[PDB]
Amino acid sequence: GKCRGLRTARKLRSHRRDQKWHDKQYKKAHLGTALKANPFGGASHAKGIVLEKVGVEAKQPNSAIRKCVRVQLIKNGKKITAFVPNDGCLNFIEENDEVLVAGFGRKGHAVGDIPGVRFKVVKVANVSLLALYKGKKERPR
Amino acid sequence: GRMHAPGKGLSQSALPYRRSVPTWLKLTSDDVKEQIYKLAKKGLTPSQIGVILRDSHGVAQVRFVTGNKILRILKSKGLAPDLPEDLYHLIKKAVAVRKHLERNRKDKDAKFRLILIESRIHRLARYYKTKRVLPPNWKYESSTASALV
Amino acid sequence: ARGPKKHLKRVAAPKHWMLDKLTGVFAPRPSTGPHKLRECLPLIIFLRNRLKYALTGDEVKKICMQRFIKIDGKVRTDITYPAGFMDVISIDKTGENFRLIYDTKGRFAVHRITPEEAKYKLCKVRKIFVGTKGIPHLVTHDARTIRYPDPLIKVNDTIQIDLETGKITDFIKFDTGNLCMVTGGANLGRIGVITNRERHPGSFDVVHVKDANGNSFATRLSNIFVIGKGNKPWISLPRGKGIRLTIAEERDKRLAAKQSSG
Amino acid sequence: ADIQTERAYQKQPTIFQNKKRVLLGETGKEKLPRYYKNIGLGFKTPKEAIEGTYIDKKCPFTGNVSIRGRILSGVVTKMKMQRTIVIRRDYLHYIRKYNRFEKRHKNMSVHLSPCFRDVQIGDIVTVGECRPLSKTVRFNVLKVTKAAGTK
Amino acid sequence: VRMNVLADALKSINNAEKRGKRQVLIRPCSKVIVRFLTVMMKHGYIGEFEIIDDHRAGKIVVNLTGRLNKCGVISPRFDVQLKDLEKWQNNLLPSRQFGFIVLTTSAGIMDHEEARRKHTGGKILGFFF
RNA sequence: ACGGGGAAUCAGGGUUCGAUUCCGGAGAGGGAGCCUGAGAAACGGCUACCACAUCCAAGGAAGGCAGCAGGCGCGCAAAUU
RNA sequence: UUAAAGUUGCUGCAGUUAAAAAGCUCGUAGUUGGAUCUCUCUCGGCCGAAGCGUUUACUUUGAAAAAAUUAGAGUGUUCAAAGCAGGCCGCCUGGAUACCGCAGCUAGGAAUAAUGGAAUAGGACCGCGGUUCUAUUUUGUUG
RNA sequence: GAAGACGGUCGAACUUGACUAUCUAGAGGAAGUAAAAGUCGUAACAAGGUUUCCGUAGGUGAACCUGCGGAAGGAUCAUUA
């Protein structure tokens, strides 16, 4: 049972803040060891420079080749594999290009089919991928 | 439920409702006090004097006849011990466990049974130091206890 | 900071000046004078905001610089001179005379007064000390020091000052049964008879006051200004008589006073 | 000589103790008049303050301190210094979330005058606020009531 | 050990309205039990009861009507200001129409409807409906 | 992590944010020392040292935008010399 | 980041088998603890001072708590978000009010909960005597 | 009454040690990670072909095996005067 006195608030307030630490949603946002491990550092987006186009394989029950891009981030030098989303969207990218990268949507976890990929390309060469895919703009060289 | 035992046992005395000294008792309160002085000069505890008057002299409760209980009679006449009755019987019991223990070192039963008699002594010495029946520096030391009893 | 502040922000102004939000960043910042800056009404707010004589804070300069304004019978050419409680403002070019008295809602009021009354004001005695070859002094709440006072003037009483000469004419003492105005707190501007004064030595005296309708209230002793001996005020009173209406009957007064129209 | 243990001369500084006397003054009595004063909040000056020979410049009955501010209380814990003791105040702090309290305590070093002699630890004492007397001491002992386990 | 005699004397009379009995024995009685029981009786929840006087601490025999749904104790006896009584009688009572919270004010052990009239706060003792 | 007044969400309880226009603190590249004055350990004052850096005829001279604009750099990220 | 999350649980979770009760016992701090007990003395004009009683927690009232924000009153910004303005044919207005935890002041209550009060009576209330210090009036002023 | 000196004090800073901490060039090997549908038995789930599981010691190609002591989460809630 729980303690239930009237002078027991120090037992109550301090049992909770030790028991709060077994909460993995609490710990991953308060310990600080998973924000120095995050490649962004707690930003929504980041920019980088494309090293190469590595295309990685889908997971078990369904087969395709997810076309990704190996990015090296500007602000801390870290490296990142980001997913180039729609079809024919690797054909707007060459090597050594500057790419704004987002998260995939699961807040630092992989999104189902793709293994170990937590980011997706947003803009290439300071123009948007939705502007290139839908033909609204032209790829600047 | 008993303190240092797992037994939850129910056995005690049941005092009656009628609080008065009964009809047949032909002893006044002064005669009962005079009996108590002799039975204490014989060297009996307050827990033994109340038994002898109940069995032989027909006194049900001395608190009901005299108006006062046993220990406040002896401590007002002066014939009372310094350390109280139940603290004596624990100290005297912890001597005989400790005295027997130097003969038989391997007895790990009475080594455990000594600590229960030990831990009951400090529960009572604390209470008597609080109610100031003992002086506030009395401590049970395991070596001097042969000369306390 | 390093040394004293010279500006006042507008939101940080006293609430009773009733300056709106959107006219500027700064508020008029009263000059040092007889009154605390939380307990005063600057002369720029009395001319521009209350009386609507001026329209900008340059016309108050143009009015005061013609020496048209006397505050307690001395001509004042500072527009941020702190006028406070019981101060007489004589404008002689138009012919009006005002006295700054609180009204029932914790603000000041435009209280026009007769020039037969404008020759005197009341002050409250704040500290009495001897000195300088044994000569006794007063200090009032206007910092007016009046040496050689009457020996029956003590602390927390009320004198009556003649404003052309500076001398005391007659006084009221602190007693029960005297008519008092509250000059601070949440009962500010309220007029009632002193019922009781509870002493708390090493702390503040509490002075229970009784209305003319029966509404009792209390204050600390420093928010107490003895106005009259008995029940007769030695100054005039505003349109409301220092008697605070609760908001229900304050509504009833409006919704019954609009029905006199046509 | 029972006062002058220091390296300078302990002297109550308001009292002049070198008045010239006549033959009925030297043969009559060597009388040192003492300075005492009344703390104004209903604390009785002890007879030791009016009959003593101690000299203390921070005693609230015979020295140069005036008691003004908060008047508080606490129980004595450690009397191991020269003229000053350690009292602990006990209080309950309300935690709002849990609607419960918690035991709390704070210590005060506080000046004990020599008029309050025979003070044992563990009894309630009224303290009174004055100016800083040392780095940590700002209260002065005003009256000492004894713990209920006395007689 | 028996901390809270009013707690064991209400779950004795809670557990017997379940089992359908017409009388409870509740030993031992304090006088906070007799004040609490008299408030339930005055609102028709309980009926007549008898205090058996042995010299130790009394027992009570309470005749039960079949009208009590729940009888409860609050532990610890939290302090309840009158501006915070609405939250308590919304957490503890089934509706705005019936049921009472018993609190011990300085004007006596009373309901929450009595304590609102006499304008009093207190410490919450328990509830019944 | 500058603190408060406060802000978001919310049945009741709560949780999280509060650099940011009001009050209070601190600081003018980093430490340190002063002059004047009612008030400064002041930087749109001075004197040093450490760090940068402008002119120079090479002997010297002058610096301090976390004021308003504006520039570079940084960055996902912010306006008119 | 907040709700959803009664998936951090004070309200309000769980612990045989789903994650989980320490091998057992003693033990200091902490936390929690059984019944019980129905305002007066020296003064001023019967009404105020002064004292309390053992000390508190609790509860209710009071006074003190910056403005802006929040709630909320009044007001046809052309509606509204706002604003503190406006209205009538020189006058008549308004610029309210609530909320402002804990700690600290104040006054009433006395249930609950802590705590004292005499047990080798150096105990209460009475009038009786002694010892030591000593007030300042008394002897037309004066030592 | 200027320069300048003795001494005091405040104290930036410099030099060399120790303790560290961080930015930086380098063979060697190290561990886990991305898969693997690659080869030998078949430890386990049926009495899973030596019931299984737990602690603890020893030996191996390895799932493991064996000595001691438990438990049933067993394959018996039971075995006759």
Alpha-carbon distance C181 to C16, whole Å? 17
- Output DSSP code: residue E84: G
Task: Please give the Cα distance from C228 to C214 (Å, whole number).
Answer: 18
Q: Domain check: are E121 and E79 in the same one?
A: yes
Amino acid of residue C57: G
CA dihedral A73, A76, A79, A81 (to 10 degrees): -50
- Domain range summary for chain C, segments of one domain joined by +: 1-116, 121-171, 174-244
Same-domain status, E45 and E31: yes
- The stretches of B2-107 forming alpha helices (DSSP H) are 29-41, 46-55, 62-65, 71-77, 85-103
A60 touches strand H (CB under 7 A): yes
CA distance E49 to E9: 13
Nucleotide F16 C1' to residue A72 CA (A): 34
Q: A101 pairs with which residues across the strands?
A: A46, A121
Structure tokens that stand for B40 in this block: 């204490």
Residue A29's identity, in one-letter code, is A
Structural domain range at position E59: 1-68
Are residues E60 and E6 part of one domain?
A: yes
Whether residue E28 has a cis bond before it, omega within 30° of 0: yes
Contact B123, B140 (CB under 8 A): no
Q: How far is CA B57 from the centre of its chain?
A: 21
Substitution target from B2, B13, B17, B63 for chain E, most E beta carbons within 10 A = B17
Is the CB of residue D53 less than 8 Å from the CB of residue D17? no
Question: Is B42 within a domain?
Answer: yes
Sheet strands side by side (includes E59-63): E23-26, E59-63, E49-52
- B123 plus B101 within the same structural domain: yes
Q: What is the signed CA dihedral for A75, A76, A81, A84, rounded to 10 degrees?
A: 0
Distance, in Å, from the CA atom of C37 to the CA atom of D3, rounded to the nearest integer, reads 55
Q: Strand E100-105 relative to strand D103-111: parallel, antiparallel, unpaired?
A: unpaired
In whole angstroms, give the CA distance from residue A94 to residue A84: 12
Same domain for B74 and B117?
no
**Residue D97 CB lies within 7 Å of the nucleic strand F:** yes
Q: Are residues E64 and E5 in the same domain?
A: yes
Do both B68 and B49 map to the same domain?
yes
At residue A15, what are phi and psi to the nearest 5 degrees? -65, -40
Tell whether B138 and B86 lie within a shared domain.
Answer: yes
What is the nearest CA distance from E90 to chain A, expressed in angstroms? 21
Phi-psi region of A82 (alpha: psi -120 to 50; beta: other; left: phi over 0): beta
Beta bridge partners of C83: C41
Please check whether residues E119 and E60 belong to one and the same domain: no
The H or E element containing residue D72 is: strand D71-78
Q: Are residues B63 and B115 in the same domain?
A: no
Whether residues E64 and E18 share a domain: the answer is yes
Other residues' Cβ atoms within 10 Å of the Cβ of residue B80: 15
Distances (CA, A) of C227 to C121, C124, C140, C169, C181: 11, 9, 15, 15, 6
What is the residue range of B42's domain? Answer: 26-80
Pairing of strands E71-73, E59-63: unpaired
Element (H, E) at B123: helix B108-130
Report residue B54 as tokens. 């109940």
> Can you tell me the distance from the alpha carbon of C168 to that of C119, in angstroms, rounded to the nearest whole number?
12
Cβ contact E73:E83 at 8 Å: no
Token pair belonging to C239: 């349109």
Q: Classify residue E45 as left (phi > 0), alpha (psi -120 to 50) or beta.
A: alpha
Tell me phi and psi for residue B75, to 5 degrees.
-75, -10
Please give the single-letter amino acid code of residue D125.
V
Whole-number Å distance between alpha carbons of E112 and E84: 11
Q: How far is D110 from chain C (nearest CA, A)?
A: 21
Residue with tokens 């609009």: C258
E39 in the same domain as E16: yes
**Cα–Cα distance measured from residue A106 to residue C251, given in angstroms and rounded to the nearest whole number:** 59
Q: Number of structural domains, chain E?
A: 2
Does residue A101 contact residue A122 with C-beta atoms inside 8 Å?
yes
Q: CA of C158, closest CA in chain D: separation in Å? A: 28
Q: Is B37 in contact with B43 (CB distance < 8 Å)? A: no
Instruction: Please answer yes or no on whether C201 and D41 come within 8 Å at the CB atom.
Output: yes
Residues 6+ apart with CB under 8 A from B134: B83, B125, B128
Among B146, B147, B149, B126, CA closest to B136 = B126
Among residues B38, B53, B80, the one where a domain terminates is B80
- Domain boundary among the residues E68, E88, E114 is at E68
Q: Is residue B19 part of a domain?
A: no
Residue C200: closest C-alpha in chain D: D41
> Do A and B count as touching (3 or more CB pairs closer than 8 A)?
no
DSSP 3-state of E25: strand
How many domains, in total, are found in chain B? 2
Q: Does E54 touch chain B (CB under 8 A)?
A: yes
Terminal C-alpha separation, chain A: 70
- Pick from A5, A8, A1: nearest CA to E75: A5
Among E68, E85, E117, identify where a domain stops: E68
Q: What is the resolution of this structure in A?
A: 3.2
Question: What does residue E119 show for φ and ψ, rounded to 5 degrees?
Answer: 60, 65
Three-state DSSP class for residue A99: strand
If DSSP codes are grouped into helix, strand and coil, which group holds residue C17?
A: helix
The residue of chain B with its CA nearest to that of E2 is: B1
d(CA C84, CA C101): 8
Query: In this structure, is the CB of residue A116 within 7 Å of any atom belonging to strand H?
Result: yes
Let me know if residue B45 belongs to a domain. Answer: yes
Q: Which residue is nearest to nucleotide G62 (CA to C1')?
A: C218
User: In this structure, are E59 and E76 located in the same domain?
Assistant: no
Burial B92-104 (b: 16+ CB within 10 A, else e): ebbbebbeeeeee
Interfacial C residues in 193-212 facing D (CB < 8 Å): 201-202
CB contact (8 A) between residue B19 and residue E55: yes
Per the CB < 8 A criterion, the answer to whether E119 and E82 are in contact is yes
User: Is residue E40 domain-shared with residue E101, that is, in the same domain?
Assistant: no
B72/B86 same-domain check: no
Q: Judge whether B96 lies within some domain.
A: yes
Is the CB of residue B117 less than 8 Å from the CB of residue B97? yes
Alpha-helical runs (H) found in chain C:
43-44, 59-64, 247-257
Is the Cβ of E55 closer than 8 Å to some Cβ of chain B?
yes
* Residue A32 CA distance to nucleotide H54 C1' (Å): 39
What CA–CA distance (Å, rounded) separates B40 from E46? 56
Residue B94 shares a structural domain with residue B76: no
Residue C196 Cβ < 7 Å to strand G: yes
H helix runs in chain A, sequence order:
9-19, 24-27, 129-133
Chains with at least 3 CB pairs less than 8 angstroms from chain A: D, E
Q: Which residue, chain included where needed, has tokens 């601070």?
A: C184
Angle B7-B13-B15 from CA coordinates, rounded to 5°: 145
Q: In a 3-state reduction of DSSP, which class is residue D126?
A: strand
